[PDB]
Design a protein around this ligand. Structure first.
Ligand code: HEM
Ligand SMILES: COc1ccc(C(=O)O)cc1
Length: 393
């Protein structure tokens, strides 16, 4: 069995994980990380197998490093992300209906419009700006908390709350331990936005509580289902949006292709999600001795699935390092796969469709205007700054 002292949460790897990914894939289907006592998977075949096989690889012992068999969770674990069937089934089906295609139809014209207002206002002021702060961060914060229906107070908690959650899936290293004094306040705030009386009458929050009225979920589940939205719903889309913007800023032919066919927006965003893989890793825990990639994972031990690695595995993807909207990215594991696969993907895509359409409407060409800067995180590939210069027609 290949065994390694590689630390996937070291600051150098988080800054640039592409060499670790390629070594993981090259070493074997399964690599034992001695540092953490887990089994790493980097190739698509095994990452796909592990994601779908919920019977062998459970989530309820936690999908971070931390094993809830023994360790105290930093918060009450997610009743979606960290629940197996049957407990998973009810809250899943509620979000699945609420965030599904049909349901989102009603928000499309609003979100297109908000995107056009954000872009018009930005462009009236500057032709050069940061795509992170001015676009990728700014647009989800305009539309998404409003669609959930939380109030305006404490909205500055959304990004740190998400950040901390994604960090907290990794080891108790400095990125988690620096977050840990501010947890109580961060948690205090989020719980407070999940109550029925904190939410507007019509948003996703409202609809979650309406599902509880019908007995789809309990009144005890209702706030934690809202909480999933406020953990997973913001940071991921910001980083997905910074990735596709960075890609278009770096790929003038691909930008022209979008401008020729605006219906390419959905597939543009999915290709960014494959190529960037905003969520890089998750854990599962083996329920039995299970054989994957030629290796036996003992009952009770954790696997580490490298989504980013699988999404650039050349066994599944031709020339994987390339961002190409010509590629069919369908089958990427950037949203996961099987019963836990991202229930917010219709939201992500509509966001990208709105923003991309607004941008392409006004912007002849786009380039990188300055150094790019990452924001380090144990689990989430985060962008801090993407300076861009746009040329108006
Ligand atoms: C680009 C954006 C996004 C990425 C890259 C992403 C990624 C993921 C991945 C990889 C999973 C699978 C978890 C696992 O298998 O253990 C997932 C699940 C989930 N995502 Fe997303 N996500 C994104 C956007 C969103 C949005 C906008 C929401 C808001 C609705 C959301 C809510 C969730 C929830 C609740 C789950 C857990 C579902 C379950 O366990 O059944 N995500 N996401
Ligand atoms: C993909 O990341 C997440 C993170 C948190 C949750 C949750 O809190 O429900 C779901 C998905």
């Amino acid at each position: 069995l290949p065994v390694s002292d590689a630390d996937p949460f070291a600051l150098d790897v988080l800054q640039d994980p592409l060499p670790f990914q390629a070594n993981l894939r090259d070493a074997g289907p399964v690599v034992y990380l001695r540092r953490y006592d887990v089994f790493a998977l980097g190739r698509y075949e095994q990452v796909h197998a592990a994601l779908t096989d919920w019977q062998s690889f459970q989530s309820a012992a936690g999908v971070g490093l931390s094993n809830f068999r023994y360790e105290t969770p930093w918060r009450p674990p997610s009743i979606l992300l960290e629940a197996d069937p049957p407990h998973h089934d009810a809250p899943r089906a509620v979000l699945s209906k609420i965030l599904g295609p049909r349901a989102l139809q009603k928000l499309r014209a609003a979100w297109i419009q908000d995107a056009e207002a954000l872009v018009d206002q930005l462009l009236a002021n500057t032709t050069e700006f940061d795509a992170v702060t001015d676009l990728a961060a700014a647009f989800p914060l305009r539309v998404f908390p409003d669609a959930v229906g939380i109030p305006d107070a404490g909205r500055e908690n959304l990004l740190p709350y998400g950040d901390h959650a994604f960090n907290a899936f990794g080891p108790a290293n400095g990125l988690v331990e620096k977050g840990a004094p501010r947890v109580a306040e961060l948690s205090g705030w989020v719980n407070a936005q999940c109550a029925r009386d904190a939410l507007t009458g019509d948003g996703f929050g409202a609809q979650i509580w309406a599902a509880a009225d019908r007995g789809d979920i309990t009144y005890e589940q209702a706030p934690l289902v809202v909480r999933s939205l406020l953990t997973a719903g913001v940071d991921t889309t910001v980083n997905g949006l910074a990735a596709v913007l960075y890609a278009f800023a770096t790929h003038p032919d691909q930008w022209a292709r979008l401008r020729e066919n605006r219906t390419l927006a959905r597939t543009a965003f999915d290709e960014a999600v494959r190529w960037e893989s905003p969520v890089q890793t998750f854990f599962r825990t083996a329920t039995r001795d299970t054989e994957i990639g030629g290796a036996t994972i003992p009952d009770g031990k954790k696997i580490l699935m490298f989504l980013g690695a699988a999404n650039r595995d050349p066994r599944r993807w031709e020339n994987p390092e390339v961002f190409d909207l010509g590629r069919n990215p369908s089958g990427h594991v950037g949203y996961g796969m099987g019963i836990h696969q991202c229930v917010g993907q219709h939201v992500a895509r509509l966001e990208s469709e709105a923003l991309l359409t607004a941008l392409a409407s006004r912007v002849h060409s786009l380039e990188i205007a300055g150094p790019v800067h990452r924001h380090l995180n144990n689990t989430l590939r985060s962008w801090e700054s993407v300076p861009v210069k746009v040329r108006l027609p």
